[PDB]
Symmetry: C9
Subunit: 181 residues, 9 copies
């Protein structure tokens, strides 16, 4: 009789409210710090997201001795996806664009935190081709403490990423004749 | 018997209260900053909304070196629509009207955040024709970091919009011989 | 049997308490600012409401360089009607009465926010004929940013109204040789 | 069987507790301000209530340049009646008694806020004949902004009342050669 | 069967707890102020209650230019009776006892607030004969603003009582050649 | 069947918890002030209780110009009895013991607040014979404002007790040539 | 059937939780003050409990003009026993041990608060023989205000104990030529 | 039928949650203070636990005139065991290791608080043989106030332990020619 | 019938929510302090986790007289595993990498807290081979107070670990001619 179906509805929507509340209350976050000590002005700050969003703007420019601070997070409500995105700036003193990438996935059973950076030719704002090149075609870093690499064109970077689901990411971008932190 | 229909009512209005509470508790917001460093007085500040509303007034005028701050939001209660609107000012020193447009939709499965600006001939306050011209007939910007364009008549703008469901929007309006932020 | 009717009463009064609580907890509000910079004394401040009420008094008079601040609201409890009303003052230096009108309706499916002002002959306190003349027989303004008009007799006004369900309204009343805000 | 009557009692007293709580939690209030700038001493301050009560005393006297502040309210608990009352003072310099009256009813479907004042012959403390004379036999003012009238004997008053269910009432009592507020 | 009697007990004690809580949570209070400016010392301060009680003591004496402050209240818990009582002092400079009486009843459907005062021969502390003489055999005042009367023996009083269920009472006792407040 | 007996137990222990909570939450309290201005040292402070208890000690002695403050209360938890007790001191300058007694009963349907004091021969600490002599064989005072009596041996007292269920008690003990408070 | 036994379990453990919570939430406490003004050093401070416990240590020594403060309490959780214990110190200037004893029982239907003190020969730390000698074989004091006795060997004490279930205990230990408090 | 087994599960897990919560919310704690005034440096601070744990480190060393403060506690969650452990230091100026032991058991129906200390030959960090030697083969102290003993090698200690389930333990370690606290 | 299966679901998901909440609310934490007083610069700080995560970065470098502070914790939500990981730095003044390891397991029925450190040849960042070499192939320390060992190459360390489930770990790394803390 229909009393079984009504009790089945109370169980069904009782479980569904808790399942949607669980996916809404799992936090994935990133906090990206990119210190410019490269000796060049950076400008035209741009972004892309494969997943997640940021509430604030970038600085339009980053003069010598100042830092980008920028805080992505997961898409809000019951959607089960993480943060994955790109950041970029153009460096008119050297004719190239710095790009930075990170990932902080939702499902850690198949994925892990990653980051990368490159200095591309000309002016090209962050997009899906920069994501696929920084994440698949280049050699990305995993999130386990400090890594250092040349960008070419007289510049290098040294940086690290936390392995946490709420990840801090830090990069110092600097001249090849200088030492980090 | 009628005891089934009464239990069916308890389930029906129990679900409906939670569904209406969900649509009432989803926030879409915008916060629009338009810095005047154009060297001209702006006046006769006007608006239009295709969806959403603002609680405060605009400034009647914006003298050189001052900013519009203006905060649209969704229509309150269970109505499932976002913020979509236009802002305008008349610039008597150059005989044209600056117009600014944004969108922060409710359903992100089909739509995304956008913005635009133009400098139209004569005096024309914000309306549905300015919305359709800024959103369909012109080339609007998507919400991914800084963009810059000429207005004509000796002016340009540089600005950005957040990809979030609670979006910050920032524009600097300035002379074509000058540099942003 | 009567157990069905008793359970039907529990459902009936359970829904009715929530329906009356909803109509009691929907806020319609107005906040009216009328800055006198007209160069004349205003006195005999009077009002009318087609719907809604105000808790405070008007100032009896408004000397040059001072403002009316006055805050109407909906009728309290489960009554489903908005704010609609008139304000007036007599200006003995010019032999006329300034009148101001606004509307902030309950049902936005059929109505919208409006405002108006006029400078009528002689002394006539606010009433239903001033409401119908300001809302139907004159050309009222809708709530979308700044509008400006002559009153005649050497005076003009410039003002705006918010499109919100809790609406701010602002008017500056000034000499025809002067500029707003 | 008797189980129906017991469930009928749970519904009956469940509704009655909410109905009595509603009539106990509906507020009718008045706040009466009577500024003496008449140039005469007032004394022997007295009152009457047709409905409602005040917790504090009047001042025994009001010298020149001071005000009565006095705050009536409805009778407490589930009783469904408003505030209706009279205030009076004797003015020994002119041989007459000032009387003031107000109403703030419970049922607004049939009644509205009113006020009045008069300057009666000799000494007569506030009573039901002063109420009926100020409310029916004289011409009372309704609660819509400022009204002004002569008392005779060299005095006038100017005053206003709020249309709210919690009403502020203000009167200035002054010489016929002087101007209000 | 006995299940009806058990459900009848749940209803019976459910109603009785709320009825006793209602009679325990209805407040009757008095606050009695008796200013001595009579030019004589008062002493041997004494009291009586027909209903209600006070937590503090009286002053043993009241010298010239000082006041009795004394705060009766209803008997605590579910007992449905008000405040009714007498206060007295002996005045050795004139050979008489000042007595003061008040009432603040529980059931306002049959009773109202009253007060009185007298100056009796010799020394006689407050008792049931002073209550019956001040409330029935003398002419008491009702609680509606200021009243004034001679005590005889060179003294008078002027005083008032609030009509509220929590009543303030004020009396000034003074020489027949002087003016109140 | 046994389901009736189980439901009868839920009612029985549901009522009993509320009945024991009521007797535990009815407060009887006393606060005893005995000002020594007798011109003699008091010492060997002692007590007795027929019902109730005090948490603090007495002072061992009371020199001239100092007061006993001492705060009895009912026995804690569901026990339905009040405060009834004796206080005493020895006065070595006059060879006698001051004793003080009070009562603050639980059941006011049969009993009332009382107090007394005496100055007994020799040294005798407070006990049941001092209680019965101060409460039955002597003439005790009831709790209605100030009373005054000689102790003999050059001393008197003047004092009062509140009629409340939480009673303040005050006594000044002084030379027969002096005046109270 | 077994549904009766399950409902019997809900009643059984529902009552048992409240009974254990009652025995856990009944407080028995003591607070022992022993002022040394004996003119001798005290040392080797030791204790015993027949019931109850203390959280802090004693001072190892008490020089002239200083006091032991020490706060026993009942054993925690549902155990229904009070505080009963002994304190001791050795006095090397006179070759004897001061011992102090108190009781604050759980069941006042059969027992009352007691205290005692003695000055025993040689060095002997507090134990069950000191408890039985101070409580049964010596003459203990009951808790009703100040008592005074010689210790022998040039010393005396004067002290008191509160009759409360949370008892303060105070003793001054002093030379036979001196006066207490 | 299976409805009995389901109701039996509700009772079973309802009782089990409360039983595990009880064993998780019973606190056993120790707080160990070991004052070094021995005139020698202590170093290589080491520990062992038969039950319980400490969150902080020991000091690596204790110079003359400083104290170890160290706070063991029971193992967290529903495990029903107390604190039992050893502490040790090496004293290079005398070629020996000080060891200290305590117990604060869970089940007081069979066990009590104990402590001990010794000065062992050579360097040997705290372990199960030090526990068994300090608790069974040596003569330990019970928790009842101050005890004092020689360590040999020119040193002694004096110390005490509280009998409480949250026990303070204090030891002063000092030269044989000196006096405690 | 299906009513049994629905009641079985209420029990099943009622238990499962509490079981997942228990595994989510059991805390395993570590807090690692590594003081550099080795007289050499440390750089290229790197990590590995066999289980658990850290939210913050390491310092890129540790100059002489400064400390690593670094706080691992368990993986968040219902996953039942502890903290187990490695830390490393390169020391360019001596051509070797310092590595540090710890464990703070979830299941204490089979495992205990451990730590270790080594100074490996060349530059090699922390990984699974450093974990297995520090935990199985080398001789690790258990968490019971201070241990000290040579690193070789002129360096040693002295350090300790807490036995708690929230463990503090401290190491001082120093020249072989110097003394700890
Ligand atoms: C809710 C939970 C999630 O947030 C955490 C991850 O949270 P986390 O920030 O502590 O990352 C620690 C995991 N890594 C070590 C970095 C891989 N779920 C898992 O781990 C896998 C759950 C697997 C099953 C649960
Ligand atoms: C409740 C939730 C909404 O608010 C969020 C969006 O909130 P957001 O501000 O984080 O925007 C992030 C989405 N973009 C990346 C910008 C497209 N619903 C969705 O995303 C799609 C839900 C799809 C199904 C849920
Ligand atoms: C509860 C809710 C009301 O308050 C809001 C209006 O609230 P608002 O102040 O945000 O005005 C925004 C609407 N306009 C853009 C100005 C027309 N109901 C509606 O909009 C229509 C509801 C239609 C159905 C719900
Ligand atoms: C509960 C509610 C009452 O308090 C309010 C009145 O409250 P108010 O103070 O806002 O007065 C506004 C009404 N006037 C414009 C002045 C006539 N009930 C009504 O209006 C009529 C209710 C009619 C049916 C509900
Ligand atoms: C609960 C309530 C009582 O307290 C109030 C009186 O409270 P009150 O202090 O406002 O006095 C106002 C009444 N007078 C104007 C002075 C006569 N019950 C009544 O009025 C009669 C109730 C009658 C039926 C309810
Ligand atoms: C719970 C309650 C207990 O704590 C109190 C005692 O508490 P108390 O500190 O107020 O002592 C006052 C009693 N004496 C006067 C000193 C004998 N139970 C009783 O009296 C007897 C209860 C008897 C039956 C209840
Ligand atoms: C929950 C409770 C436990 O904590 C307390 C002990 O707590 P305690 O710190 O007050 O020690 C006082 C006991 N001694 C005097 C020292 C032996 N259980 C018991 O006593 C025995 C319980 C026995 C049955 C309950
Ligand atoms: C929930 C609880 C866990 O956290 C604690 C451990 O917590 P802990 O930090 O106090 O470590 C004390 C244990 N050791 C002495 C160090 C081995 N479970 C256990 O002990 C074993 C539980 C076994 C059964 C429960």
């Amino acid at each position: 009789a229909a009393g079984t179906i009504i009790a089945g509805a109370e169980l069904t929507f009782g479980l569904l409210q808790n399942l949607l509340y669980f996916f809404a209350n799992v936090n994935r976050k990133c906090a990206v710090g990119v210190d410019n000590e490269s000796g060049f002005r950076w400008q035209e700050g741009s972004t892309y997201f494969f997943s997640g969003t940021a509430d604030e703007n970038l600085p339009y420019s980053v003069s010598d001795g100042y830092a980008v601070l920028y805080g992505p997070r997961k898409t809000n409500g019951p959607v089960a996806t993480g943060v994955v995105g790109v950041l970029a700036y153009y460096i008119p003193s050297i004719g190239k664009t710095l790009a930075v990438m990170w990932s902080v996935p939702f499902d850690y059973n198949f994925y892990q935190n990653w980051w990368n950076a490159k200095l591309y030719s000309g002016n090209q704002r962050a997009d899906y081709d920069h994501y696929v090149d920084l994440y698949y075609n280049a050699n990305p870093f995993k999130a386990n403490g400090w890594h250092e690499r040349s960008l070419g064109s007289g510049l290098k970077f040294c940086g690290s990423m936390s392995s946490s689901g709420q990840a801090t990411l830090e990069i110092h971008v600097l001249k090849e004749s200088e030492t980090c932190m």
